C-alpha cells in the first residue's frame, strides 16, 4: 500500500519480541539454512545496520491508480467472476446471527477464543474472554456497543501490528524480512463473519477449479481431484507474485467488493461496507501510527478468500487486456490467496501479460525460474501448489501431494517447547507421500525419543481418505 501518514503518539503498543521456537533433535542432523525470524532490532543474527521496523513496512511501495478504461475493464471481469461464483454457490448469503458467528456453522470453524483481542482492548489489558462468551455464543456490553456502531457505518478502528514468529530462510532472517500479522479488533472479525460468513462456508464446501478456489480443501484427498483436472490441458503455468497482499490497489479492492458483495446476491448492505474498511487502514506499532491506503490486512477473517477472489479477477483482467474474445472457459485456474495454478489449451503468452498485471500494481514471475521467463508446454506434474508437488502414487493410481525434503527437514528442525510430539504426528501426515525411504530418513533423529507413526499405518489411512471404495476393493 501507500504510507500517507506517520505520527508518534504518547501511547506505546508493546509487541512480542521473544521467540517461542526452539531447535529440535533434527536440527543437529539436517542443518537447515533456516531459522526463526528476527523479533528484536538487536538480534545478533541480523545484518549489522538493518533497522527491523523499516523492512517490515518496506513492502508498502505505493497504491497503483488505475485509469478509467482499466477500471471499467476490471469491473466487467469482477462482475463476470461474481456471476460464475454465485451461480455455483447460490444466493443464500443472509447475515449470520451473533451466536452462529462465534460458534461457527457447517463449513466455517468457530472463532478462536484465546488469540489476540485487538485494539483498544489490548491497552485495557483485556483478553478475548472478557469481551465475548465463547461458551454460550453471546456478547458483552463492549462488543455490543461496537456492533451497533457498525450498523450505523460510523465505526473506525486501528490495526495492531504483530511480528510473525515463524521459520524463514536464513537470507530473509538475516535481511530482517520478518512478516507481520495485522490483528484487527475482535468485533470487526465477528461482524465480518456476520456479514459474509455464510458465503465463506459455501466457498469452502464448493472449493475447486469451477470457482477457482482451493480455500477449504484437504490436499490429501483433493489432490486427486485437482491433478486429474489439470492433466487434461496442453499448457499449465506456475505463477508467482511478489507482495501480493500489499499490492492490491484501492481501485481493484473497491470495485471487487462492489461487484461481488451486492445485495442482489443475497448479501446485507453492510457486507460491502465492512470489507471496504480494509482499504484505508491505520496501523499501530509501538509509539508509531502508520496510515496506509490500499492493500489487504492479514488478520481479517476472510483474507484468504478475498485474496483468492482478486487472484481470479486478475487473471481474467490481464488476459482480456491483451487478447480479444477471452471468457471464463478460455482457461482454468485454482487459487489459494496469492498461490496460483493456471491452465489452458491455448498457447497463452504469459510473458507478455507482465505489464498487464503491472497496471494492477502486481508483479508476476514463473515459479521454476528459468531463462527467458514463462514457457509453454508445462504440465501439472511440473508445478507447485500449497508447497506441494503433484506426484502419481504408483500403488493406487492417485495423485499425492509431495513436499520437498528440504522443507520437511526445516519444519522438523524447530518446534515450540512441549509441542514436539503433536508436531511430529502432524508432519508425518505430510511426509508419508515422500515414500518409505525418505519418510524413514526424515524421522530418524526422533526414533526412541518420541512416537513416530509407521509409514504403513499412514499410507493405509490415506488410501481410504482419498477413495473408500478403492480400499474396500483392495480386499478382493
Ligand atoms: Mg506456485
Residue numbers in the entry: 1 to 476
How is this structure described in the published paper?
P44S but not P169S was detected in a 70% proportion in R-Ap35, as evidenced by analysis of both the consensus sequences and their corresponding mutant spectra. These results suggest that the three substitutions in 3D were selected sequentially during replication in the presence of increasing concentrations of R: first M296I, then P44S and finally P169S.
The RNA molecule appeared mostly disordered in the two structures. The X-ray structures were determined to 2.2 Å and 2.6 Å resolution for 3D(P44S) and 3D(P169S), respectively, and to 2.6 Å and 2.5 Å for 3D(P44S, M296I) and 3D(SSI), respectively. Subtle domain movements, in particular a ∼1° rotation of the thumb domains relative to the fingers, were observed between the unbound, tetragonal, and the RNA-bound, trigonal structures when the individual domains were superimposed. As a consequence of this rotation, the active site appeared more closed in the unbound state. Thus, the changes observed seem to be a consequence of either RNA-binding, or of the different packing constraints in the tetragonal and trigonal space groups or both, but they do not seem to be related to the presence of substitutions P44S or P169S. Finally, P169 is a non-conserved residue located in motif F of 3D that has been implicated in the recognition of the triphosphate moiety of the incoming nucleotide. P169 is close to 3D residues that directly contact with either the triphosphate or ribose moieties of the incoming nucleotide. However, we can not exclude that a change at this position could also affect the recognition of an incoming nucleotide, modulating its incorporation rate, and thus altering the replication fidelity or replicative fitness.
